[PDB]
PDB file of all heavy atoms in Angstrom:
ATOM      1  N   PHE A 211      97.392-195.259 -55.668  1.00  8.64           N
ATOM      2  CA  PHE A 211      96.746-194.638 -54.510  1.00  8.64           C
ATOM      3  C   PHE A 211      97.461-193.332 -54.141  1.00  8.64           C
ATOM      4  O   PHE A 211      96.808-192.295 -53.944  1.00  8.64           O
ATOM      5  CB  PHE A 211      96.786-195.553 -53.295  1.00  8.64           C
ATOM      6  CG  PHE A 211      95.948-196.835 -53.410  1.00  8.64           C
ATOM      7  CD1 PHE A 211      96.496-198.036 -52.901  1.00  8.64           C
ATOM      8  CD2 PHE A 211      94.692-196.836 -53.990  1.00  8.64           C
ATOM      9  CE1 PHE A 211      95.767-199.208 -52.978  1.00  8.64           C
ATOM     10  CE2 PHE A 211      93.949-198.009 -54.050  1.00  8.64           C
ATOM     11  CZ  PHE A 211      94.489-199.203 -53.568  1.00  8.64           C
ATOM     12  N   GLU A 212      98.791-193.349 -54.163  1.00  6.49           N
ATOM     13  CA  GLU A 212      99.516-192.129 -53.853  1.00  6.49           C
ATOM     14  C   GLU A 212      99.391-191.094 -54.944  1.00  6.49           C
ATOM     15  O   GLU A 212      99.365-189.899 -54.611  1.00  6.49           O
ATOM     16  CB  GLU A 212     100.970-192.450 -53.558  1.00  6.49           C
ATOM     17  CG  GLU A 212     101.042-193.118 -52.199  1.00  6.49           C
ATOM     18  CD  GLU A 212     100.376-192.327 -51.073  1.00  6.49           C
ATOM     19  OE1 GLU A 212     100.821-191.221 -50.773  1.00  6.49           O
ATOM     20  OE2 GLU A 212      99.381-192.838 -50.528  1.00  6.49           O
ATOM     21  N   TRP A 213      99.237-191.411 -56.224  1.00  4.72           N
ATOM     22  CA  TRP A 213      99.042-190.404 -57.242  1.00  4.72           C
ATOM     23  C   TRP A 213      97.686-189.728 -56.985  1.00  4.72           C
ATOM     24  O   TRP A 213      97.591-188.465 -57.086  1.00  4.72           O
ATOM     25  CB  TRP A 213      99.062-191.018 -58.665  1.00  4.72           C
ATOM     26  CG  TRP A 213      98.670-190.018 -59.751  1.00  4.72           C
ATOM     27  CD1 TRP A 213      99.597-189.184 -60.357  1.00  4.72           C
ATOM     28  CD2 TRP A 213      97.396-189.732 -60.220  1.00  4.72           C
ATOM     29  NE1 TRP A 213      98.929-188.398 -61.159  1.00  4.72           N
ATOM     30  CE2 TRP A 213      97.622-188.694 -61.111  1.00  4.72           C
ATOM     31  CE3 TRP A 213      96.085-190.208 -60.002  1.00  4.72           C
ATOM     32  CZ2 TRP A 213      96.551-188.097 -61.799  1.00  4.72           C
ATOM     33  CZ3 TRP A 213      95.036-189.620 -60.681  1.00  4.72           C
ATOM     34  CH2 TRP A 213      95.248-188.580 -61.580  1.00  4.72           C
ATOM     35  N   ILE A 214      96.619-190.431 -56.631  1.00  6.67           N
ATOM     36  CA  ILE A 214      95.308-189.803 -56.379  1.00  6.67           C
ATOM     37  C   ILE A 214      95.454-188.763 -55.256  1.00  6.67           C
ATOM     38  O   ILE A 214      94.991-187.619 -55.380  1.00  6.67           O
ATOM     39  CB  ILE A 214      94.264-190.919 -55.990  1.00  6.67           C
ATOM     40  CG1 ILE A 214      93.974-191.766 -57.229  1.00  6.67           C
ATOM     41  CG2 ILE A 214      92.950-190.304 -55.478  1.00  6.67           C
ATOM     42  CD1 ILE A 214      93.202-193.069 -56.849  1.00  6.67           C
ATOM     43  N   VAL A 215      96.140-189.098 -54.169  1.00  3.69           N
ATOM     44  CA  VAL A 215      96.289-188.194 -53.036  1.00  3.69           C
ATOM     45  C   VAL A 215      97.224-187.031 -53.348  1.00  3.69           C
ATOM     46  O   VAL A 215      96.825-185.883 -53.181  1.00  3.69           O
ATOM     47  CB  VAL A 215      96.813-189.002 -51.818  1.00  3.69           C
ATOM     48  CG1 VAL A 215      97.026-188.136 -50.599  1.00  3.69           C
ATOM     49  CG2 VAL A 215      95.748-190.042 -51.443  1.00  3.69           C
ATOM     50  N   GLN A 216      98.425-187.308 -53.860  1.00  2.70           N
ATOM     51  CA  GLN A 216      99.438-186.275 -54.031  1.00  2.70           C
ATOM     52  C   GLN A 216      99.253-185.423 -55.247  1.00  2.70           C
ATOM     53  O   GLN A 216      99.533-184.229 -55.190  1.00  2.70           O
ATOM     54  CB  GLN A 216     100.858-186.863 -54.102  1.00  2.70           C
ATOM     55  CG  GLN A 216     101.312-187.794 -52.981  1.00  2.70           C
ATOM     56  CD  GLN A 216     101.113-187.297 -51.563  1.00  2.70           C
ATOM     57  OE1 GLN A 216     101.165-186.103 -51.277  1.00  2.70           O
ATOM     58  NE2 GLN A 216     100.890-188.187 -50.594  1.00  2.70           N
ATOM     59  N   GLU A 217      98.748-185.993 -56.347  1.00  2.00           N
ATOM     60  CA  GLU A 217      98.634-185.228 -57.562  1.00  2.00           C
ATOM     61  C   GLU A 217      97.215-184.912 -57.975  1.00  2.00           C
ATOM     62  O   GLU A 217      96.981-184.056 -58.829  1.00  2.00           O
ATOM     63  CB  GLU A 217      99.329-185.950 -58.685  1.00  2.00           C
ATOM     64  CG  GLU A 217     100.792-186.325 -58.463  1.00  2.00           C
ATOM     65  CD  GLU A 217     101.771-185.168 -58.265  1.00  2.00           C
ATOM     66  OE1 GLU A 217     101.596-184.124 -58.902  1.00  2.00           O
ATOM     67  OE2 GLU A 217     102.718-185.325 -57.520  1.00  2.00           O
ATOM     68  N   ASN A 218      96.158-185.610 -57.486  1.00  3.97           N
ATOM     69  CA  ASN A 218      94.826-185.294 -57.976  1.00  3.97           C
ATOM     70  C   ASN A 218      93.915-184.771 -56.893  1.00  3.97           C
ATOM     71  O   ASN A 218      92.682-184.910 -56.961  1.00  3.97           O
ATOM     72  CB  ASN A 218      94.170-186.545 -58.606  1.00  3.97           C
ATOM     73  CG  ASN A 218      93.121-186.156 -59.656  1.00  3.97           C
ATOM     74  OD1 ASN A 218      92.118-186.821 -59.876  1.00  3.97           O
ATOM     75  ND2 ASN A 218      93.327-185.100 -60.426  1.00  3.97           N
ATOM     76  N   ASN A 219      94.490-184.234 -55.833  1.00  2.00           N
ATOM     77  CA  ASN A 219      93.735-183.684 -54.698  1.00  2.00           C
ATOM     78  C   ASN A 219      92.736-184.646 -54.078  1.00  2.00           C
ATOM     79  O   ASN A 219      91.669-184.283 -53.602  1.00  2.00           O
ATOM     80  CB  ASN A 219      92.974-182.422 -55.132  1.00  2.00           C
ATOM     81  CG  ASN A 219      93.940-181.273 -55.397  1.00  2.00           C
ATOM     82  OD1 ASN A 219      94.333-181.010 -56.527  1.00  2.00           O
ATOM     83  ND2 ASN A 219      94.373-180.561 -54.397  1.00  2.00           N
ATOM     84  N   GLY A 220      93.150-185.930 -54.081  1.00  7.38           N
ATOM     85  CA  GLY A 220      92.367-186.983 -53.491  1.00  7.38           C
ATOM     86  C   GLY A 220      91.172-187.393 -54.329  1.00  7.38           C
ATOM     87  O   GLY A 220      90.478-188.319 -53.895  1.00  7.38           O
ATOM     88  N   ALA A 221      90.922-186.829 -55.519  1.00  6.96           N
ATOM     89  CA  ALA A 221      89.733-187.104 -56.299  1.00  6.96           C
ATOM     90  C   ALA A 221      89.763-188.356 -57.150  1.00  6.96           C
ATOM     91  O   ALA A 221      90.774-188.689 -57.773  1.00  6.96           O
ATOM     92  CB  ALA A 221      89.436-185.927 -57.213  1.00  6.96           C
ATOM     93  N   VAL A 222      88.629-189.064 -57.185  1.00  4.60           N
ATOM     94  CA  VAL A 222      88.483-190.247 -58.060  1.00  4.60           C
ATOM     95  C   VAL A 222      87.190-189.975 -58.811  1.00  4.60           C
ATOM     96  O   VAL A 222      86.122-189.795 -58.207  1.00  4.60           O
ATOM     97  CB  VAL A 222      88.344-191.586 -57.231  1.00  4.60           C
ATOM     98  CG1 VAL A 222      88.145-192.729 -58.191  1.00  4.60           C
ATOM     99  CG2 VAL A 222      89.569-191.820 -56.364  1.00  4.60           C
ATOM    100  N   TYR A 223      87.278-189.898 -60.125  1.00  5.48           N
ATOM    101  CA  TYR A 223      86.108-189.553 -60.937  1.00  5.48           C
ATOM    102  C   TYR A 223      85.156-190.724 -61.161  1.00  5.48           C
ATOM    103  O   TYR A 223      85.561-191.890 -61.028  1.00  5.48           O
ATOM    104  CB  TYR A 223      86.505-189.070 -62.335  1.00  5.48           C
ATOM    105  CG  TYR A 223      87.497-187.940 -62.367  1.00  5.48           C
ATOM    106  CD1 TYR A 223      88.633-188.081 -63.176  1.00  5.48           C
ATOM    107  CD2 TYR A 223      87.324-186.753 -61.639  1.00  5.48           C
ATOM    108  CE1 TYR A 223      89.580-187.073 -63.310  1.00  5.48           C
ATOM    109  CE2 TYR A 223      88.272-185.724 -61.754  1.00  5.48           C
ATOM    110  CZ  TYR A 223      89.390-185.888 -62.593  1.00  5.48           C
ATOM    111  OH  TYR A 223      90.298-184.870 -62.793  1.00  5.48           O
ATOM    112  N   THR A 224      83.890-190.412 -61.420  1.00  2.67           N
ATOM    113  CA  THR A 224      82.935-191.460 -61.717  1.00  2.67           C
ATOM    114  C   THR A 224      83.278-192.103 -63.044  1.00  2.67           C
ATOM    115  O   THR A 224      83.798-191.433 -63.936  1.00  2.67           O
ATOM    116  CB  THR A 224      81.464-190.936 -61.796  1.00  2.67           C
ATOM    117  OG1 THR A 224      81.383-189.942 -62.819  1.00  2.67           O
ATOM    118  CG2 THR A 224      81.039-190.408 -60.465  1.00  2.67           C
ATOM    119  N   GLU A 225      82.917-193.389 -63.242  1.00  6.32           N
ATOM    120  CA  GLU A 225      83.179-194.098 -64.489  1.00  6.32           C
ATOM    121  C   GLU A 225      82.366-193.473 -65.604  1.00  6.32           C
ATOM    122  O   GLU A 225      82.808-193.279 -66.721  1.00  6.32           O
ATOM    123  CB  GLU A 225      82.796-195.572 -64.333  1.00  6.32           C
ATOM    124  CG  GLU A 225      83.364-196.455 -65.419  1.00  6.32           C
ATOM    125  CD  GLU A 225      83.063-197.936 -65.291  1.00  6.32           C
ATOM    126  OE1 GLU A 225      82.767-198.418 -64.175  1.00  6.32           O
ATOM    127  OE2 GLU A 225      83.135-198.656 -66.265  1.00  6.32           O
ATOM    128  N   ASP A 226      81.172-193.069 -65.269  1.00  2.69           N
ATOM    129  CA  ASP A 226      80.211-192.402 -66.156  1.00  2.69           C
ATOM    130  C   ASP A 226      80.788-191.132 -66.769  1.00  2.69           C
ATOM    131  O   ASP A 226      80.669-190.861 -67.981  1.00  2.69           O
ATOM    132  CB  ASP A 226      78.945-192.073 -65.373  1.00  2.69           C
ATOM    133  CG  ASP A 226      78.480-193.304 -64.579  1.00  2.69           C
ATOM    134  OD1 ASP A 226      79.083-193.665 -63.522  1.00  2.69           O
ATOM    135  OD2 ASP A 226      77.535-193.919 -65.063  1.00  2.69           O
ATOM    136  N   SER A 227      81.502-190.334 -65.947  1.00  2.00           N
ATOM    137  CA  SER A 227      82.076-189.098 -66.450  1.00  2.00           C
ATOM    138  C   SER A 227      83.460-189.273 -67.042  1.00  2.00           C
ATOM    139  O   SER A 227      84.002-188.324 -67.608  1.00  2.00           O
ATOM    140  CB  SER A 227      82.108-188.055 -65.332  1.00  2.00           C
ATOM    141  OG  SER A 227      83.046-188.320 -64.299  1.00  2.00           O
ATOM    142  N   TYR A 228      84.135-190.401 -66.855  1.00  2.00           N
ATOM    143  CA  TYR A 228      85.403-190.649 -67.530  1.00  2.00           C
ATOM    144  C   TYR A 228      85.391-192.141 -67.877  1.00  2.00           C
ATOM    145  O   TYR A 228      86.047-192.953 -67.202  1.00  2.00           O
ATOM    146  CB  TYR A 228      86.597-190.276 -66.604  1.00  2.00           C
ATOM    147  CG  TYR A 228      87.918-189.994 -67.330  1.00  2.00           C
ATOM    148  CD1 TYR A 228      88.938-189.331 -66.625  1.00  2.00           C
ATOM    149  CD2 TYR A 228      88.167-190.325 -68.683  1.00  2.00           C
ATOM    150  CE1 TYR A 228      90.139-189.029 -67.224  1.00  2.00           C
ATOM    151  CE2 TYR A 228      89.385-190.022 -69.273  1.00  2.00           C
ATOM    152  CZ  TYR A 228      90.382-189.359 -68.555  1.00  2.00           C
ATOM    153  OH  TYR A 228      91.581-189.025 -69.157  1.00  2.00           O
ATOM    154  N   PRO A 229      84.670-192.531 -68.939  1.00  2.00           N
ATOM    155  CA  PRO A 229      84.465-193.940 -69.345  1.00  2.00           C
ATOM    156  C   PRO A 229      85.748-194.605 -69.810  1.00  2.00           C
ATOM    157  O   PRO A 229      86.714-193.902 -70.185  1.00  2.00           O
ATOM    158  CB  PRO A 229      83.436-193.892 -70.442  1.00  2.00           C
ATOM    159  CG  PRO A 229      82.813-192.544 -70.305  1.00  2.00           C
ATOM    160  CD  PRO A 229      83.928-191.635 -69.830  1.00  2.00           C
ATOM    161  N   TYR A 230      85.780-195.929 -69.790  1.00  2.00           N
ATOM    162  CA  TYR A 230      86.960-196.658 -70.230  1.00  2.00           C
ATOM    163  C   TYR A 230      87.097-196.479 -71.718  1.00  2.00           C
ATOM    164  O   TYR A 230      86.152-196.661 -72.495  1.00  2.00           O
ATOM    165  CB  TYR A 230      86.833-198.150 -69.928  1.00  2.00           C
ATOM    166  CG  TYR A 230      88.164-198.894 -69.960  1.00  2.00           C
ATOM    167  CD1 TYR A 230      89.200-198.524 -69.076  1.00  2.00           C
ATOM    168  CD2 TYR A 230      88.352-199.942 -70.861  1.00  2.00           C
ATOM    169  CE1 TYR A 230      90.401-199.220 -69.080  1.00  2.00           C
ATOM    170  CE2 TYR A 230      89.566-200.637 -70.854  1.00  2.00           C
ATOM    171  CZ  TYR A 230      90.576-200.286 -69.956  1.00  2.00           C
ATOM    172  OH  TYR A 230      91.785-200.950 -69.969  1.00  2.00           O
ATOM    173  N   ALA A 231      88.304-196.103 -72.073  1.00  2.00           N
ATOM    174  CA  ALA A 231      88.636-195.797 -73.449  1.00  2.00           C
ATOM    175  C   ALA A 231      89.890-196.542 -73.911  1.00  2.00           C
ATOM    176  O   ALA A 231      90.385-196.285 -75.025  1.00  2.00           O
ATOM    177  CB  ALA A 231      88.848-194.292 -73.563  1.00  2.00           C
ATOM    178  N   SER A 232      90.441-197.470 -73.148  1.00  5.36           N
ATOM    179  CA  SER A 232      91.672-198.137 -73.492  1.00  5.36           C
ATOM    180  C   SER A 232      91.551-199.588 -73.923  1.00  5.36           C
ATOM    181  O   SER A 232      92.556-200.318 -74.004  1.00  5.36           O
ATOM    182  CB  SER A 232      92.636-198.011 -72.295  1.00  5.36           C
ATOM    183  OG  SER A 232      93.016-196.652 -72.105  1.00  5.36           O
ATOM    184  N   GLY A 233      90.361-200.067 -74.313  1.00  7.03           N
ATOM    185  CA  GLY A 233      90.114-201.446 -74.689  1.00  7.03           C
ATOM    186  C   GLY A 233      90.973-201.937 -75.848  1.00  7.03           C
ATOM    187  O   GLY A 233      91.335-203.110 -75.884  1.00  7.03           O
ATOM    188  N   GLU A 234      91.371-201.049 -76.773  1.00  6.02           N
ATOM    189  CA  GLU A 234      92.171-201.446 -77.924  1.00  6.02           C
ATOM    190  C   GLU A 234      93.664-201.557 -77.592  1.00  6.02           C
ATOM    191  O   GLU A 234      94.459-202.007 -78.421  1.00  6.02           O
ATOM    192  CB  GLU A 234      92.027-200.446 -79.081  1.00  6.02           C
ATOM    193  CG  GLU A 234      90.617-200.339 -79.657  1.00  6.02           C
ATOM    194  CD  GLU A 234      90.017-201.686 -80.054  1.00  6.02           C
ATOM    195  OE1 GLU A 234      90.594-202.367 -80.904  1.00  6.02           O
ATOM    196  OE2 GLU A 234      88.937-202.050 -79.564  1.00  6.02           O
ATOM    197  N   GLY A 235      94.068-201.150 -76.381  1.00  7.95           N
ATOM    198  CA  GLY A 235      95.459-201.303 -75.989  1.00  7.95           C
ATOM    199  C   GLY A 235      96.227-199.997 -75.909  1.00  7.95           C
ATOM    200  O   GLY A 235      97.452-200.016 -75.671  1.00  7.95           O
TER     201      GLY A 235
END
């Protein structure tokens, strides 16, 4: 939560525009 506020200007991207890519580990 604090990284979103302090380092990403409060932004949370849509899942559609940044899909999950870490399923393989």
Side-chain angles (χ1 to χ4, degrees):
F211 295 139
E212 286 308 295
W213 173 88
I214 292 166
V215 179
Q216 307 309 329
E217 304 297 325
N218 206 213
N219 290 97
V222 178
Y223 308 129
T224 58
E225 195 177 339
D226 311 76
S227 70
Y228 202 164
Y230 197 61
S232 292
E234 298 306 303

